[PDB]
Amino acid sequence: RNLSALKRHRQSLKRRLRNKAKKSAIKTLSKKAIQLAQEGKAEEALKIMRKAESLIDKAAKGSTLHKNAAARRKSRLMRKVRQLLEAAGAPLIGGGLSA
Amino acid sequence: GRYIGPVCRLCRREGVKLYLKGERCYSPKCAMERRPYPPGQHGQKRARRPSDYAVRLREKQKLRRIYGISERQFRNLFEEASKKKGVTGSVFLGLLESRLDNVVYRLGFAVSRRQARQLVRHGHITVNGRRVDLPSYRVRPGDEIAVAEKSRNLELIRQNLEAMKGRKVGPWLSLDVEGMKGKFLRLPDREDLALPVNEQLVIEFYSR
Amino acid sequence: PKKVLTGVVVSDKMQKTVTVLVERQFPHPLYGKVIKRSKKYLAHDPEEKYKLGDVVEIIESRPISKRKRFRVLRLVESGRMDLVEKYLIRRQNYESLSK
Amino acid sequence: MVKIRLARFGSKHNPHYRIVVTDARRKRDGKYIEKIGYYDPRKTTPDWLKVDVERARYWLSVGAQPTDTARRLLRQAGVFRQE
Amino acid sequence: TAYIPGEGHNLQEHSVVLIRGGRVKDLPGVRYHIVRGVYDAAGVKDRKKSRSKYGTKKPKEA
RNA sequence: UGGAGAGUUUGAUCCUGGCUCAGGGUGAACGCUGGCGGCGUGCCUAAGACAUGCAAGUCGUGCGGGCCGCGGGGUUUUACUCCGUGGUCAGCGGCGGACGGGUGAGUAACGCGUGGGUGACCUACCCGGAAGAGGGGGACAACCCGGGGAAACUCGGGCUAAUCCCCCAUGUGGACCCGCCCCUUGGGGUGUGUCCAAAGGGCUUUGCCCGCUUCCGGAUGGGCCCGCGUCCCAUCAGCUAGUUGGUGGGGUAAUGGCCCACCAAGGCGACGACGGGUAGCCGGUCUGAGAGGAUGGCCGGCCACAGGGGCACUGAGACACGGGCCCCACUCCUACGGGAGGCAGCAGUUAGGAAUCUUCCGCAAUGGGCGCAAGCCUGACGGAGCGACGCCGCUUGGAGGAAGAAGCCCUUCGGGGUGUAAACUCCUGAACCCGGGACGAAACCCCCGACGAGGGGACUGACGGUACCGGGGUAAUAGCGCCGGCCAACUCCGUGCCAGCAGCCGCGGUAAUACGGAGGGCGCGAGCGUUACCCGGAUUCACUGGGCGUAAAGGGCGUGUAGGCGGCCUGGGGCGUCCCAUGUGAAAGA
Ligand SMILES: [Mg+2]
Ligand SMILES: [Mg+2]
Ligand SMILES: [Mg+2]
Ligand SMILES: [Mg+2]
Ligand SMILES: [Mg+2]
Ligand SMILES: [Mg+2]
Ligand SMILES: [Mg+2]
Ligand SMILES: [Mg+2]
Ligand SMILES: [Mg+2]
Ligand SMILES: [Mg+2]
Ligand SMILES: [Mg+2]
Ligand SMILES: [Mg+2]
Ligand SMILES: [Mg+2]
Ligand SMILES: [Mg+2]
Ligand SMILES: [Mg+2]
Ligand SMILES: [Mg+2]
Ligand SMILES: [Mg+2]
Ligand SMILES: [Mg+2]
């Protein structure tokens, strides 16, 4: 009756939560940042972007994201942050993104 | 296979003296001498003129009966000849004649081709020193065909190699009666065999 | 190599796309006659530079839409409205084949 | 990874392998990248182990692992000896 | 419908039968033969010549 | 190096023309008959349903426990069961379960084939190279406790270890925005900003072995895209709303209406859209003179599917054949509370069927997964078994033996046939029995060397006491179809449009070479016939290679669209075309 692919199942479930956590975190922060960039709040927009960047990259490390995927996430975040800001802006918290 | 059953009864029907018993089919006996007509209740009746088919059927059957070879083996042997290089008729004979059972008869280690079969098959023949018992075995130019050392002095073998002192063995072969060895030198030319068989009609048999 | 094909622009009703009709000729596999078949290709024209009648090299490309996998390479010659008229007559004749 | 290994050819009670390089994940008798030697474990002929050494070395140098049994046979034709 | 070849037979209303294919130039709409010697179709008794059609066992030469 | 035709429409003829046959072939089936071996090959139907066993695991050199057998003495020992090692058990953690194996249901499609593209991408383990492995924390099972259960086991509370999780650091390097240079679809570089690493285990230990992290390159395997090729019906002619395109997003490794907002109104179709029907596609295979036609079982490659349908998770990879969720269908256990299941893996059962095998042996080999290794696992595989299913080989005797026994058949009552066939004499010696007995197996490992090269040693065989060799040794299975013509092979009896035959012409009405039997013959022969299906013959769909006055066939006639085809001369181009080189055309097959 029994195979211990059951194990693999038990395990997939743990990782499934692990990655869910990192992923939903990455979107709440990415959203938050673009939202602040649009309000024009650039110290906190960039503040958050950095956090998001970190968490995306942290995620690239194992199975959760990888690759061009994180890079992409990052790319779109700072493409979207830098521009919303630029409409008003000045990149206050000089942190996060190239001069 | 090899038929098994009355022979100098197709020594007849083909109407032409094959040599299936070797020695008797030379006495006032191969029935070609006595009853040169087909077997059976008819046989000595008006011959109805043969269909083009029967002409060839008979020619084909003649040749085959000469070597004592199954039709499946024969057709195969023939189809091989056709694919092979140059004149299918001549080549095909050479392949028939390259057979071990027949080589052994041509050496006169045996009286008849039936006999040769039985000798080969019973371990009495050896090719290049190792013993062969496959009548169908193909003999190649340059092969020593001898009589097995243990068989060397058997009643039948001494009788048969006693008669080979005197005789000439076909040009494409060599023989060493004292030491009971033979050599297949080359493939038989179409003329080296005086066959009572127009092989060109046999090719035509298989064309249908 | 990227496949280059040449042919005429028979439609520019779309935005940044031209429909390019390519004639080609092969011997018939059995009967040997040279036959002439034709295919239409939607071709990216990002600078709406090409107009109806333009004969154009078409080049194989990174997909640009479903359907579009060919960019316009260059302009062989211009205003061949004769080849355009031909195709449209062939198309208009269909109206007279139904029930 | 990619492998140097014995592909079985010949026939029943007639093993005749090909020394072949192939993704490990192919079936044994399947498609392979390249043939390099052949091997006849019963030495029914004198030329019963052959190997193209200069190719086996290319393949070893780009990270093909050989089978134990394959290694043994490349060794035997001196793929491994270096003077 | 199906022809029952052979002199004599033993087929009746629920006899099981092997059908064969082969029509009969003579009975219209008889496209099939019955295979004698199989299921409930008996062989043909006393048959001695074309014995393997007609599903007849080789008779004993006591 | 390659090509045969014949019968049948007439009183007879020529032509037309259909029907029919001889040949080859098959995963075959059925009938009669059957001796051996070798190599192949065997559910073509119900992608119906399946009892039972086995088909995927492995690491104690990742980690902490439970249990046991020992060593070594704790109270001297059985009651507090303590250290060391070698077993086992689950658990946690890895790597594998995406390969291998099955099947052909769906699919008419970039599915496949073939050639290309990716400046639009990924690739665990393997290799080469560079630089790291420095700090800290934490939780979940196991385990104990309790509630729950008939059990499966299930919940709660608490303990805990690591190569489990998490933060911090270093940043060789890498990612990302932006600017600059080069390059030209997103390719390479560079600057500042931000953001990102890691794991320990084992030994004979200031050295080795296995692992961990980041980057670059390689190799291998992939994804996506495009040209061309890919069945029948037009009594299916119009099709289309994410539909065609754009913009901006989302998504992915990556392009893309893949998905979503918005805008535009497109896109496709007689060069056959759409629809319906059928079908997995190819290397090949069968047939054929070829061109073609048919096919795609076995073996190889690609695709699809895993009771039907949808779905995602984990992950280098899956939308997962022996993983998961839900719906549906069906079945099973049940204490009626609930549980369990998916052979198109190997065998096997059952049903359906004309019909298709052992619930076999072994991991010795080759290959695969895990492991430092020993080794474990492997119904992949190697073998054995059964089946004349197929092909190849072999036997059932050989030489002698009468103008020719007997029997049986014919008879013109002299004969003739079976028939050298038998009897009979010699000879050989399938089977048998005796003795001996393989290759396939040398590696991994061990020792010298350095755990490299190189040298030396040890183990290992399912098949198998088999193949084969040696020695003895018995005359030792033969049947099936046909004998009117095509078609090779004829007489007698029985029968009398009956019984029956039959592929076509047609045979059968009392002298039947055509029915049934006999003798005799012809053809094959452990087979011979039958039925079915494919090609041939069929130049009867005709490219090769046909036709339409009367045989079937000129549209009732114009006009004309698409299309097809296009006089003479000169030049440019070089698409067709031809040439050369070169790449590709896998292996197997030929
Ligand atoms: Mg939220
Ligand atoms: Mg008959
Ligand atoms: Mg008439
Ligand atoms: Mg039987
Ligand atoms: Mg393609
Ligand atoms: Mg986009
Ligand atoms: Mg994915
Ligand atoms: Mg189908
Ligand atoms: Mg032809
Ligand atoms: Mg099923
Ligand atoms: Mg299963
Ligand atoms: Mg049944
Ligand atoms: Mg034809
Ligand atoms: Mg005609
Ligand atoms: Mg008329
Ligand atoms: Mg007419
Ligand atoms: Mg007219
Ligand atoms: Mg015109």
Short mmCIF file of C-alpha atoms (C1' of nucleotides) in Angstrom, two decimals, chain F residues 171-377:
data_model
loop_
_atom_site.label_atom_id
_atom_site.label_comp_id
_atom_site.label_asym_id
_atom_site.label_seq_id
_atom_site.Cartn_x
_atom_site.Cartn_y
_atom_site.Cartn_z
"C1'" G F 171 31.21 40.74 -2.59
"C1'" U F 172 35.88 37.23 -6.24
"C1'" G F 173 31.93 38.12 -8.54
"C1'" G F 174 26.59 38.56 -10.12
"C1'" A F 175 21.55 41.06 -10.56
"C1'" C F 176 18.74 45.76 -11.32
"C1'" C F 177 17.60 51.27 -12.77
"C1'" C F 178 20.17 55.29 -15.21
"C1'" G F 179 24.39 57.52 -18.04
"C1'" C F 180 28.56 56.64 -21.49
"C1'" C F 181 31.40 53.56 -25.48
"C1'" C F 182 31.12 49.52 -28.76
"C1'" C F 183 27.64 46.32 -31.02
"C1'" U F 184 22.89 46.27 -33.45
"C1'" U F 185 15.92 43.32 -31.73
"C1'" G F 186 17.19 42.04 -25.07
"C1'" G F 187 24.78 40.90 -27.67
"C1'" G F 188 29.65 42.76 -25.13
"C1'" G F 189 31.85 46.66 -21.87
"C1'" U F 190 31.88 50.53 -18.19
"C1'" G F 191 30.68 54.28 -13.99
"C1'" U F 192 28.02 55.70 -9.56
"C1'" G F 193 23.40 53.97 -6.50
"C1'" U F 194 20.86 49.85 -4.54
"C1'" C F 195 20.45 44.40 -3.96
"C1'" C F 196 22.53 38.99 -3.43
"C1'" A F 197 26.22 34.00 -1.18
"C1'" A F 198 27.44 29.62 1.70
"C1'" A F 199 27.16 23.44 5.24
"C1'" G F 200 29.11 20.70 7.06
"C1'" G F 201 30.74 15.31 7.21
"C1'" G F 202 34.75 11.49 7.43
"C1'" C F 203 39.92 9.82 8.28
"C1'" U F 204 45.94 7.13 9.74
"C1'" U F 205 44.62 15.03 10.59
"C1'" U F 206 48.36 21.40 10.85
"C1'" G F 207 47.56 16.98 5.04
"C1'" C F 208 44.13 14.06 2.26
"C1'" C F 209 38.45 12.35 0.63
"C1'" C F 210 33.51 13.57 0.03
"C1'" G F 211 30.15 17.37 0.09
"C1'" C F 212 28.35 23.67 0.70
"C1'" U F 213 28.40 29.15 -1.89
"C1'" U F 214 29.08 32.89 -5.99
"C1'" C F 215 30.65 33.95 -10.90
"C1'" C F 216 32.66 32.78 -15.89
"C1'" G F 217 33.25 29.08 -19.79
"C1'" G F 218 32.29 24.04 -21.56
"C1'" A F 219 29.57 19.88 -22.49
"C1'" U F 220 24.70 17.36 -22.58
"C1'" G F 221 19.59 17.77 -22.61
"C1'" G F 222 15.51 21.03 -23.47
"C1'" G F 223 11.67 25.35 -24.47
"C1'" C F 224 9.73 28.83 -27.93
"C1'" C F 225 9.82 30.58 -33.48
"C1'" C F 226 9.89 30.31 -38.71
"C1'" G F 227 10.20 28.19 -44.55
"C1'" C F 228 8.55 24.03 -46.99
"C1'" G F 229 6.00 18.83 -46.71
"C1'" U F 230 1.92 16.09 -44.26
"C1'" C F 231 -5.57 11.90 -45.83
"C1'" C F 232 -11.12 11.72 -47.55
"C1'" C F 233 -16.07 14.93 -48.23
"C1'" A F 234 -17.54 21.34 -51.40
"C1'" U F 235 -24.18 16.82 -50.98
"C1'" C F 236 -19.20 21.48 -45.52
"C1'" A F 237 -18.64 28.12 -48.77
"C1'" G F 238 -18.32 31.28 -46.18
"C1'" C F 239 -15.37 31.57 -41.09
"C1'" U F 240 -13.82 34.81 -36.88
"C1'" A F 241 -14.88 38.59 -30.31
"C1'" G F 242 -9.25 37.80 -27.69
"C1'" U F 243 -11.45 37.54 -33.16
"C1'" U F 244 -6.63 40.72 -36.46
"C1'" G F 245 -3.47 44.65 -35.00
"C1'" G F 246 -1.74 48.63 -31.64
"C1'" U F 247 -0.56 50.87 -26.65
"C1'" G F 248 0.35 49.79 -21.59
"C1'" G F 249 0.36 45.81 -18.14
"C1'" G F 250 0.20 40.77 -16.17
"C1'" G F 251 2.87 36.07 -16.87
"C1'" U F 252 7.17 32.97 -18.14
"C1'" A F 253 13.51 30.73 -18.37
"C1'" A F 254 11.97 33.29 -22.86
"C1'" U F 255 8.85 35.71 -27.80
"C1'" G F 256 3.96 35.76 -28.29
"C1'" G F 257 -3.76 37.79 -27.67
"C1'" C F 258 -0.39 33.35 -23.68
"C1'" C F 259 -3.70 36.40 -20.20
"C1'" C F 260 -5.95 41.51 -18.93
"C1'" A F 261 -7.47 46.80 -19.37
"C1'" C F 262 -7.75 50.57 -23.23
"C1'" C F 263 -7.69 52.07 -28.62
"C1'" A F 264 -8.32 50.80 -33.77
"C1'" A F 265 -11.30 47.35 -37.28
"C1'" G F 266 -9.08 44.15 -38.41
"C1'" G F 267 -7.58 38.82 -39.62
"C1'" C F 268 -8.80 34.07 -42.64
"C1'" G F 269 -11.05 31.76 -47.14
"C1'" A F 270 -11.97 28.20 -54.04
"C1'" C F 271 -3.82 28.50 -53.74
"C1'" G F 272 -10.33 25.43 -50.19
"C1'" A F 273 -11.02 29.18 -44.70
"C1'" C F 274 -14.94 26.93 -41.59
"C1'" G F 275 -17.23 22.37 -40.86
"C1'" G F 276 -17.69 16.74 -40.91
"C1'" G F 277 -15.07 12.09 -41.27
"C1'" U F 278 -10.74 9.32 -40.61
"C1'" A F 279 -5.51 9.06 -38.54
"C1'" G F 280 -0.52 9.39 -33.77
"C1'" C F 281 3.92 11.26 -37.50
"C1'" C F 282 8.93 9.52 -39.13
"C1'" G F 283 13.65 6.12 -39.94
"C1'" G F 284 11.49 2.27 -42.32
"C1'" U F 285 8.26 -1.75 -44.21
"C1'" C F 286 5.42 -4.70 -48.09
"C1'" U F 287 4.61 -4.54 -53.23
"C1'" G F 288 6.29 -2.74 -57.90
"C1'" A F 289 10.37 -2.75 -63.96
"C1'" G F 290 9.91 1.75 -62.32
"C1'" A F 291 7.11 5.93 -61.30
"C1'" G F 292 3.73 4.77 -58.09
"C1'" G F 293 0.54 2.13 -54.65
"C1'" A F 294 -0.27 0.46 -49.73
"C1'" U F 295 1.43 0.41 -44.68
"C1'" G F 296 3.83 2.56 -39.98
"C1'" G F 297 3.26 -4.40 -35.54
"C1'" C F 298 8.66 -5.63 -33.77
"C1'" C F 299 13.53 -2.22 -33.47
"C1'" G F 300 15.10 3.37 -33.38
"C1'" G F 301 13.60 8.90 -33.19
"C1'" C F 302 9.59 12.70 -32.08
"C1'" C F 303 4.65 13.54 -30.10
"C1'" A F 304 0.36 12.40 -26.97
"C1'" C F 305 -1.99 9.89 -23.06
"C1'" A F 306 -1.89 7.21 -17.62
"C1'" G F 307 -10.26 5.34 -15.46
"C1'" G F 308 -13.01 10.51 -18.00
"C1'" G F 309 -12.38 15.90 -17.15
"C1'" G F 310 -10.14 20.27 -15.05
"C1'" C F 311 -6.17 22.18 -11.79
"C1'" A F 312 -2.00 23.54 -9.72
"C1'" C F 313 2.09 22.29 -5.96
"C1'" U F 314 6.98 20.75 -5.34
"C1'" G F 315 11.00 21.17 -8.35
"C1'" A F 316 16.99 22.06 -12.87
"C1'" G F 317 12.98 19.79 -15.00
"C1'" A F 318 6.22 17.71 -14.29
"C1'" C F 319 1.22 20.35 -14.60
"C1'" A F 320 3.95 14.26 -12.93
"C1'" C F 321 2.07 6.41 -15.30
"C1'" G F 322 3.12 3.35 -9.74
"C1'" G F 323 2.79 12.31 -6.29
"C1'" G F 324 -1.44 15.83 -4.93
"C1'" C F 325 -6.49 18.62 -5.20
"C1'" C F 326 -11.61 18.88 -7.07
"C1'" C F 327 -15.76 17.16 -10.38
"C1'" C F 328 -17.67 12.69 -13.00
"C1'" A F 329 -17.95 7.43 -13.92
"C1'" C F 330 -17.01 2.72 -11.58
"C1'" U F 331 -15.35 -0.72 -7.63
"C1'" C F 332 -13.72 -2.24 -2.48
"C1'" C F 333 -13.33 -2.36 3.18
"C1'" U F 334 -16.86 -0.61 7.23
"C1'" A F 335 -18.02 -1.57 14.02
"C1'" C F 336 -22.44 2.82 9.34
"C1'" G F 337 -18.22 6.86 12.51
"C1'" G F 338 -15.86 6.75 8.20
"C1'" G F 339 -11.98 4.66 5.00
"C1'" A F 340 -9.55 2.72 0.38
"C1'" G F 341 -8.58 2.24 -5.23
"C1'" G F 342 -6.69 3.13 -10.47
"C1'" C F 343 -1.76 -3.01 -14.61
"C1'" A F 344 -1.80 1.55 -21.51
"C1'" G F 345 4.98 -1.43 -15.94
"C1'" C F 346 6.14 -7.57 -15.54
"C1'" A F 347 3.49 -11.64 -15.00
"C1'" G F 348 -1.39 -13.01 -14.45
"C1'" U F 349 -7.45 -12.96 -14.14
"C1'" U F 350 -11.96 -11.76 -16.36
"C1'" A F 351 -14.75 -10.01 -20.44
"C1'" G F 352 -14.76 -9.03 -25.73
"C1'" G F 353 -12.61 -11.94 -29.85
"C1'" A F 354 -11.14 -15.95 -35.44
"C1'" A F 355 -6.78 -14.94 -32.14
"C1'" U F 356 -1.89 -13.68 -29.10
"C1'" C F 357 2.50 -16.64 -23.68
"C1'" U F 358 5.21 -17.81 -17.67
"C1'" U F 359 1.45 -15.09 -11.67
"C1'" C F 360 9.40 -18.46 -14.89
"C1'" C F 361 15.36 -17.48 -13.67
"C1'" G F 362 18.89 -13.94 -12.50
"C1'" C F 363 20.89 -9.10 -11.45
"C1'" A F 364 26.62 -13.01 -13.89
"C1'" A F 365 26.47 -9.16 -18.04
"C1'" U F 366 25.15 -4.06 -20.24
"C1'" G F 367 22.66 0.11 -18.72
"C1'" G F 368 20.11 3.29 -14.66
"C1'" G F 369 19.16 5.55 -9.37
"C1'" C F 370 21.53 6.40 -4.55
"C1'" G F 371 26.34 5.87 -1.72
"C1'" C F 372 33.33 7.94 -0.09
"C1'" A F 373 32.91 2.80 -0.26
"C1'" A F 374 31.21 -1.91 0.85
"C1'" G F 375 26.84 -2.23 -1.38
"C1'" C F 376 21.60 -1.59 -1.89
"C1'" C F 377 17.54 -1.18 -5.41
#
